[PDB]
Amino acid sequence: ITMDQGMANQASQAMQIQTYCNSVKQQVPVDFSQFPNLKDNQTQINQGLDLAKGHADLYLNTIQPQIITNISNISNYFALQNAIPAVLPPGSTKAQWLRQLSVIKEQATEYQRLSSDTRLVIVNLNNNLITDSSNFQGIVVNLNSKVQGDNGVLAQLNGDIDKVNAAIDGAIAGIVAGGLLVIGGAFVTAIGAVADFVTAGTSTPVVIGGVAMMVAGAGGITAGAIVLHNSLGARQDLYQKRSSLNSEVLIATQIGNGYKGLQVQAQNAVTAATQMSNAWDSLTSDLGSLITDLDKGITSGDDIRQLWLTAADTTVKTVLTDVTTIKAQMAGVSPLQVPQTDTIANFVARLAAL
Incomplete structure (x- = not known):
């Protein structure tokens, strides 16, 4: 795997999980004070949610910065590489070459460690x-049995939501991935409720996993709304369609489906993280082989100089360009203002028809 793909994929996945975590932290705790036979159930829900907010926090506060630091190291690496054919003028002895390569391999290996640790x-x-996601699921089914509800219909909703959530995830990835490397590009995010929480009275909106991301320029927002609105609606349809499920249970299940959603974001992050380490490992081995071959009679400093100048003009200029645009996207990302009583699917529906 190339350094440019590992970097593009992790950057892309990070901006999606970031958004998701923000939605976790925005979720309000449930309110069942009306039915005192559920206090034990409320407590359980809200303790589970705080674990979910804990995981979200850990990602934004511990993992995200390391991802950001990684992107900056890719730039560090290639700028150090481009600089060596300048620091070692045409005479330069094999010793000089061995010392320079050995030093930049050291620095790179250190970047490999950051990425593999991540x-x-x-x-x-x-x-x-x-x-933590599987345990929440059981806190929902416990509540359902305590209100003598059908565990079988509940199950068929969870299964139906999981399939749609994957469609959403898919389209969002598509939008972010396709705009990530566009030189002037930016991104906007939208966090809203997965279901209507006002037509009937009792208002506990569920925004966890209720998300959308679009390109900020031109008609990017509209263009974005269009590919997203189908999947988003489908989910809202499933929570609004007529069902035997207690309302209190419908809330906890919405939350629970978001909780699941958080863990799938993590699994997507494992994938991207693995790909980026492998890219670093492939790079440190190539450097490793370059040193070894200079050390034998196989290559020379003059040959490496040649190889890194044609690299500096062709494949490195590309990488360093993307690194700039990637750091810009991630830092530039901006949130759309969503009306407090709106839904994410309704919001996107209306933006899609402008």
């Missing part, structure tokens, strides 16, 4: 989310 901490996050 992969390891995302893996561990995911594993803890799988457990």
Whole structure:
């Protein structure tokens, strides 16, 4: 795997999980004070949610910065590489070459360590989310049995939501991935409720996993709304369609489906994180082989100079360009203002028809 794809994929996935985590943290705790036979159930829900907000926080506060630092190291690396054929003028001895390559390999290996450590901490996050996400599911089914509801209809909703959530995830990835590397590009995010929470009275909106992301320029917002609105509506349809499910249970299940959504974002992050480490490992081995071959009679400093100048003009200029535009996108990302009583699907529906 090339350094430009590993970087493009992790940047892309990070901006999506970032948004998702923001939606986790925005979720309000449930309110069942009306039915005192559910206090134990409320408590359970809200303790589970705080675990979900804990995982979200850990991602934004510990993992995201390392991802940002990684992107900056890719630039560090290639700028150091381009600089060597300038620091070592045409005479330069084999010794000089061995010292320079050995030094930049050291620096690169250190970047490999940051990236592999990151992969390891995302893996561990995911594993803890799988457990924490599976336990929440049981807190929902416990509540459902306590209101003598059908566990079978509940199950068919969870299954139906999981399939749609994957469609959403898919389209969002498509939007971000397709605009990520456009030189002037930016992104806007939208966080809203997965279901209507005002037509009937009791208002507990569920924004966890209720998300949308679009290109900020031109008619990017509209263009974005169009590919997103189908999948988003489909989900809202499933929570609004007539069902035997208690309302209190419908809330906890909405939350629970968002919780699941968080863990799938983590699993997507494992994938991207793995790809970026492998890109670093492939790079440190190539450097490793370059040193080894200079050390034998196979290559020379003059040959490496040649190889890194044609690289500096062709494949490196590309990478360094993308690194600039990627750091811009991630730092530039901006949130759309969503009306407090709106839904994410309705919001996007209306933006899609402008």
